[PDB]
Design a protein around this ligand. Structure first.
Ligand SMILES: CCCCCCCCCCCCCCCC(=O)O
Ligand SMILES: CCCCCCCCCCCCCCCC(=O)O
Ligand SMILES: CCCCCCCCCCCCCCCC(=O)O
Ligand SMILES: CCCCCCCCCCCCCCCC(=O)O
Ligand SMILES: CCCCCCCCCCCCCCCC(=O)O
Ligand SMILES: Oc1ccc(Cl)c2cccnc12
Ligand SMILES: [Cl-]
Ligand SMILES: [Cl-]
Ligand SMILES: [Cl-]
Ligand SMILES: [Cl-]
Ligand SMILES: [Cl-]
Ligand SMILES: [Cl-]
Ligand SMILES: [Cl-]
Ligand SMILES: [Ru+3]
Ligand SMILES: [Ru+3]
Length: 581
């Protein structure tokens, strides 16, 4: 293209162009104030307008990396605010762009964004929809300089949807805050999810990533030929490789190219893409990333003929080990959208170990002709765990199910800080709430999707402050054994009971005057501490004081006097509890 900026401006449109320019600059100049970014956007935007009017116009033939880097090196305060980053301006492309890339600062030190009151928010939204919305877009991008820009744009449009609706409703806050809590959860999860793929790719290498992609792409497009899945796995591996490196434009072009290939070859891939493929370039690769699985072809054969009977197993394996294993993964995954990806990786690795053991032995076929028996226990384990836990979740509430998780995980690893124990148990409990309302045909992918983002981010929090050798051993091992390792943790019988502290189990009337959530957290915080102080307490014994405490609060949080019921009756509850434990 004669002018890449004019071309982008025509592909995306003025509104999307401006928003992505803002995110781009907010992710590099993370301490410049919001109003100078607006100046940069308006300046880049009306320059781009000269380029769509005339592509021979001055500077319109420069590359976007050049144009972007040029804009960065005109910030007058660049060396005084970003210091060493300003020295990038003395290099030339592509060294300069790489130098700027290196100087992206993850985890900068900005105050946390405090959600204001609903009436404050709706009033700001009404008084200046754009400035309000773009300011929050800027606040989030500067605090997440590696969050892929278009997805951030796609979250911004969903926030706009939440405000327009709820700022008009009768009970504003009742409409808005759940939507805002929901959006925060996904954006935080997506941020965690991107950094996990990009950190297992280097921890574990291209091969393991390719193995994961074959499984995932085969469940999604089970009518595609394995040659087509392998083509897609290759392009997709390059795409995540390049996107992990951090160049937003080089990353965006790889994604857009892959989506153009997929949309051009739908009838070799899937019948579900005609709408996504009709969508504009900015949304094309996103839409297809989250499209639902295509229907499996009717009455596929068993995997027996190709992978256990056929005399050419060991010979076809040796001819190309990974391609043969990759074919096995393809055939198993396409038949099993109900499995998690990691389970399919367990099976494939299981098939790999026995093929490696039997293809070197006398009469291989005898040695390995039963390996499909080895798959059954590996399949029951995730399913069993889902059943019992989804069963328990509908026996108890969401909140009481959290309290069940709370007791169990505290007993397994009582060294974890109380607040971290509460947050994980509350979150896991949320995962029963959404995943357990799926049928068994789609429960295991649901759990995997959510556990993975609860598991390694408790592991990144654990590498921050290690407290147990067993949770580092879980967290530093394969992503296929991550969830089993944690499931295999047993009640810590090394632990020394925490010394009784009276202030930890003293309660006041403020507890009546707190929100349901904030009341549950403090109820759940005391429960962790109770299990830490008397860890040999049984759930029968624990239920008895939990019932007592429940009655205690409902008594003192309703009497004529309150501040004194909580100390007088409170003193009784404690003493009666210590006696029973
Ligand atoms: C002057 C600064 C350089 C130009 C700034 C352009 C901002 C980046 C363009 C984003 C392209 C988005 C393409 C979406 C397609 C996809 O993700 O598959
Ligand atoms: C078919 C194209 C890609 C070929 C490369 C993928 C071969 C699959 C290998 C499966 C090995 C076991 C599964 C991964 C386990 C792990 O990474 O810990
Ligand atoms: C879906 C229920 C989850 C309830 C809260 C989490 C605690 C139990 C999780 C058990 C299910 C594990 C399945 C993960 C998939 C896999 O690792 O193959
Ligand atoms: C910072 C370290 C915190 C670790 C605290 C232990 C919490 C373990 C919960 C992880 C999920 C376990 C696997 C699924 C359910 C199970 O089988 O227990
Ligand atoms: C053993 C010495 C201290 C005395 C014990 C008092 C603190 C008990 C722990 C509170 C658990 C509250 C959770 C149950 C109530 C509910 O779910 O609403
Ligand atoms: O930390 C975050 C990452 C991504 C997104 Cl979209 C967020 C939205 C609101 C608050 N925090 C967020
Ligand atoms: Cl936040
Ligand atoms: Cl907010
Ligand atoms: Cl604002
Ligand atoms: Cl604000
Ligand atoms: Cl804001
Ligand atoms: Cl944030
Ligand atoms: Cl967040
Ligand atoms: Ru704001
Ligand atoms: Ru955030």
């Amino acid at each position: 293209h004669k002018s890449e900026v004019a071309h982008r401006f025509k592909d995306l449109g003025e509104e999307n162009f401006k928003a992505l320019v803002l995110i781009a600059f907010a992710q590099y100049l993370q301490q410049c104030p919001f109003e100078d970014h607006v100046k940069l956007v308006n300046e880049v935007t009306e320059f781009a307008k000269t380029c769509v009017a005339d592509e021979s116009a001055e500077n319109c033939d420069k590359s976007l990396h050049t144009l972007f880097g040029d804009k960065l090196c005109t910030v007058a305060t660049l060396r005084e605010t970003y210091g060493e980053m300003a020295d990038c301006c003395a290099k030339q492309e592509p060294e300069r762009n790489e130098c700027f890339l290196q100087h992206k600062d993850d985890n900068p030190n900005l105050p946390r964004l405090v959600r204001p009151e609903v009436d404050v928010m709706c009033t700001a939204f009404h008084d200046n929809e754009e400035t309000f919305l773009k300011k929050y877009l800027y606040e989030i991008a500067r605090r997440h300089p590696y969050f892929y820009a278009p997805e951030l744009l796609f979250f911004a449009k969903r926030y706009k949807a939440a405000f327009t609706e709820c700022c008009q409703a009768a009970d504003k806050a009742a409409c808005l805050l759940p939507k805002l809590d929901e959006l925060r959860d996904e954006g935080k999860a997506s941020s965690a999810k991107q950094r996990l793929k990009c950190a297992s790719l280097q921890k574990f290498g291209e091969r393991a990533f390719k193995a994961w992609a074959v499984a995932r792409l085969s469940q999604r497009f089970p009518k595609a030929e394995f040659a087509e899945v392998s083509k897609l796995v290759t392009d997709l591996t390059k795409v995540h490789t390049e996107c992990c490196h951090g160049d937003l434009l080089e990353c965006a072009d790889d994604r857009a190219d892959l989506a153009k290939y997929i949309c051009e070859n739908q009838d070799s891939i899937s019948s579900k893409l005609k709408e996504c493929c009709e969508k504009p370039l900015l949304e094309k690769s996103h839409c297809i990333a989250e499209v639902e699985n295509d229907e499996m072809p009717a009455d596929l054969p068993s995997l027996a003929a190709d992978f256990v009977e056929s005399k050419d197993v060991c010979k076809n394996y040796a001819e190309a080990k990974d391609v043969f294993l990759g074919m096995f993964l393809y055939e198993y995954a396409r038949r099993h959208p109900d499995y998690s990806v990691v389970l399919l990786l367990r099976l494939a690795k299981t098939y790999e170990t026995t093929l490696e053991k039997c293809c070197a032995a006398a009469d291989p076929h005898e040695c390995y002709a039963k390996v499909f028996d080895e798959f059954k226990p590996l399949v029951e384990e995730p399913q069993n765990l889902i059943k019992q836990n989804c069963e328990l979740f509908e026996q108890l509430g969401e909140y009481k199910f959290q309290n069940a998780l709370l007791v169990r995980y505290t007993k397994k690893v009582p060294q974890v800080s109380t607040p971290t124990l509460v947050e994980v148990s509350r979150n896991l409990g949320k995962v029963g709430s959404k995943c357990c309302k799926h049928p068994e045909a789609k429960r295991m992918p649901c759990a995997e999707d959510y556990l993975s983002v609860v598991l390694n981010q408790l592991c990144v929090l654990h590498e921050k402050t290690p407290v147990s050798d067993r949770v580092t051993k879980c967290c530093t091992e394969s992503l296929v054994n991550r969830r089993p390792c944690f499931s295999a943790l047993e009640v810590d019988e090394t632990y020394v009971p925490k010394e009784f502290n009276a202030e930890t189990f003293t309660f006041h009337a403020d507890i009546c005057t707190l929100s349901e959530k904030e009341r549950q957290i403090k109820k759940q915080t005391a429960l962790v501490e109770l299990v830490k102080h008397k860890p040999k307490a049984t759930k029968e014994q624990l239920k008895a004081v939990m019932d007592d405490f429940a009655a205690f609060v409902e008594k003192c949080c309703k009497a004529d006097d309150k501040e004194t019921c909580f100390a007088e009756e409170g003193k009784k509850l404690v003493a009666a509890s210590q006696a029973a434990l």
